[PDB]
């Protein structure tokens, strides 16, 4: 009679909360999805071994079109868990799955876990200063989407930081790199000539957040566009003007150049 | 000789990530602070029992003024952990403590935990639609803060939601309720009269996120300003223009008036 939405955290199998693990261990069935994101620092095998339950993986269609035919029926007469990378209900379409549960006469509870939305705090940027967030998407065929670029302009205009998720093909395991995102943005800039993202723009790159050894780097696009930030996933952040303390952190902790202490403050 | 900033999570001691618990268990000395937020579902005892260590609680002054004299010294010789509610670097100034660690020749690592900042996902509001966030601070003497009112206006104009952290004076056991935050906002509307926050403004209240049964309520200020949402902590959210599915969730899950189902696009 209960469905548990349990987050797995940021990077590996230990990023799940003690509450999340203990509850999942007492469930009769355990589902998971890895289409909204992947746990780059672990495997399904390691996650199963830790929970001690076999985990049936679901596709985007399994969830989006048949959550009520696949997961909810079992939740009617058992304790069922639905695992997802990060914090549950962060992924735009997930909240409504709770409405489905309600409609099916199933109770649902949410066990939270670390999300990249809060993990970026490790970049030293004050979290209250973040504005609208967006995802950078790959152009394709006759379609060049550029709204993420307009958002950077609108946020920075107001002194707000912009968090940019990079496109991902979880099935193909093809991640967009911070480098590809920057070059995409330089291309969009050349098209709109808006002066929003150039070689002189200051950006922050966060890779493998959650890991004990994440890669935190800050600098101008002209020097970072070709730097190796390691293995995915990659998160890109275009900061609005900086508070002196944020700059000091980026310089001391993320190796940013002294120049931002006068140029971007 | 290392320093770990370990988040304890949103509500009780089980909201700590497995990574955090296992590392906290092997540390030589364990420090913590409980003034940046409130964990209503646990006590210091349960935390000590859970990690098997004496925890010495620090005050805002011990941290802001003597972190480098109290904590950093031991980090030179032993492995130390600094426990904080939620995520250690979110809506705090704890990030700056890493700079102090570096300048003292001490290595630091951050272990994330579920933060209220991503927990907003449980309100059904798309977290990418959140704009700049702010804190509603208690008036002090003749000084009456009002920036949080302008922020709501700014975000609303852009159709973005506004997350409002509520104030806290842990040394006096004071935790601002959503009700008090609403009262303060109506007063500010009085001074400014920008038509930003009134009896007809739709708001969302999330209380004690992280527990199995948090209070999630949505409605008009005229009907919510006197309603009891349980014990703290509470945050307050002033949504902008809603998406259809955001509205459906608020009504079905957060018990909002059916008529916010009709959006004025
Ligand atoms: N479980 C919870 N439920 C509702 N609000 C919460 C909360 N935990 C924190 N808050 C809100 O945030 C304020 C403290 S701000 C510090 C936040 C913390 N680092 C984190 O990651 O969550 C509180 O006064 C309250 O308004």
Residue at token pair 């210091």: B44
In DSSP terms, B165 is beta-bridged to B135, B235
User: How far, in Å, is the centroid of ligand 1 from the Cα of B156?
Assistant: 23
Is the beta carbon of B67 within 6 A of some atom in ligand 1? no
In DSSP terms, B166 is beta-bridged to B136
CB–CB of B127 and A110 under 8 A?
no
- Nearest Cα of chain B lies from the Cα of A35 at a distance, in angstroms, of 18
A124 dihedral zone (left: phi>0; alpha: psi -120 to 50; beta): left
Element (H, E) at A56: strand A56-58
Burial (CB count within 10 angstroms: exposed 0-12, middle 13-18, buried 19+), residue B159: middle
Per the CB < 8 A criterion, the answer to whether A210 and A114 are in contact is yes
CB–CB of A128 and B134 under 8 A?
yes
- Nearest partner of B62 among B87, B32, B92, judged by Cα: B32
Is the beta carbon of B85 within 6 A of some atom in ligand 1? yes
Q: How far apart are CA B188 and CA B150, in angstroms?
A: 10
Resolution in A: 2.5
Q: How far apart are CA A204 and CA A181, in angstroms?
A: 12
| Measured CA distances, B210 to A58, A256, B13, B152 (Å) | 26, 36, 10, 26
Count CB-CB contacts under 10 A for residue A142: 5
Per the CB < 8 A criterion, the answer to whether B198 and B186 are in contact is yes
Q: How far apart are CA A16 and CA A86, in angstroms?
A: 9
Count CB-CB contacts under 10 A for residue A35: 20
Which chain A residue has the Cα nearest residue B251?
A: A99
Helix axes B178-192, B147-157, angle to 10 degrees: 80
List, in order, residues 6 or more apart from B136 with CB less than 8 Å away.
B145, B148, B164, B165, B166, B167, B176, B181, B184, B185, B236
Q: How far apart are CA B80 and CA B99, in angstroms?
A: 16
Which CATH superfamily is A1-114 part of? Answer: Tetrapyrrole methylase, N-terminal domain (3.40.1010.10)
CB–CB of A248 and B134 under 8 A?
no
Tokens of A40: 């780059």
Element (H, E) at A251: helix A244-252
Q: Which CATH architecture has domain B115-265?
A: 2-Layer Sandwich (3.30)
CB–CB of A128 and B132 under 8 A?
yes
- Nearest Cα of chain A lies from the Cα of B189 at a distance, in angstroms, of 22
Residue ranges covered by each domain of chain B: 1-114, 115-265
Mutation site, B2, B19, B92, interface A, largest A CB count within 10 A? B19
CB–CB of A96 and B122 under 8 A?
no
- Nearest partner of B53 among B63, B61, B43, B44, judged by Cα: B44
In DSSP terms, A169 is beta-bridged to A174
Q: Whose CA is nearest to atom 26 of ligand 1?
A: B166
Mutation choice for ligand 1 from B14, B82, B86, CB with most ligand atoms inside 8 A? B86
Q: How far apart are CA B88 and CA B101, in angstroms?
A: 15
- With H, G, I as helix, E, B as strand and everything else as coil, classify residue A265: coil
**How many Cα atoms are found within 13 Å in the side-chain-facing hemisphere of A250?**
30
SS3 labels along A163-207: EEEECEECCCCEECCHHHHHHHHHHHHHHHCCCCCCCCCEEEEEE
Any long-range contacts for A67-70 (C-beta under 8 Å, 24+ apart)?
A67/A97, A67/A100, A68/A100, A68/A103, A68/A104, A70/A31
Per the CB < 8 A criterion, the answer to whether B222 and B237 are in contact is no
Per the CB < 8 A criterion, the answer to whether A120 and B112 are in contact is no
- Core vs surface per residue B195-230: b (16+ CB within 10 A) or e: ebbeeebbbbbbbbbbbeebbbbbbbbeebbeeebe
- Nearest Cα of chain A lies from the Cα of B46 at a distance, in angstroms, of 13
């Amino acid at each position: 009679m209960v469905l548990y939405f349990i987050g797995l955290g940021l990077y590996d199998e230990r990023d799940i909360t003690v509450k999340g693990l203990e509850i999942a261990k007492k469930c009769d069935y355990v589902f998971a999805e890895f289409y909204t994101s992947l746990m780059a620092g672990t495997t399904l095998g390691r996650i199963q071994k830790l929970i001690g339950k076999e985990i049936r993986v679901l596709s985007r269609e399994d969830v989006e079109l048949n959550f009520e035919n696949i997961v909810l029926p079992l939740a009617k007469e058992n304790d069922v868990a639905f695992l997802t990378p990060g914090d549950p209900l962060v992924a735009t379409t997930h909240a409504e799955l709770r409405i489905r549960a309600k409609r099916a006469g199933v109770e649902s509870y949410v066990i939270h876990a670390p999300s990249i939305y809060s993990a970026v705090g490790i970049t030293g940027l004050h979290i209250y200063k973040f504005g609208k967030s967006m995802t950078v998407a790959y152009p394709e065929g006759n379609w060049f989407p550029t709204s993420y670029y307009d958002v950077i302009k609108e946020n920075a205009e107001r002194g707000l930081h912009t968090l940019l998720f990079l496109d991902i093909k979880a099935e193909k395991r093809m991640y967009m790199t911070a480098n590809e995102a920057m070059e995409l943005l330089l291309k969009v800039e050349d098209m709109k000539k808006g002066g929003v993202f150039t070689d002189d723009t200051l950006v922050v790159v966060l890779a493998r957040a959650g890991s004990l050894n994440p890669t935190i780097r800050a600098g101008y696009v002209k020097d970072l566009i070709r730097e190796d930030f390691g293995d995915p996933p990659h998160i890109l952040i275009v900061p609005g003007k900086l508070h002196i303390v944020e700059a000091e952190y980026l310089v001391e902790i993320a190796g940013a150049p002294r120049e931002i202490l006068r140029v971007n403050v």
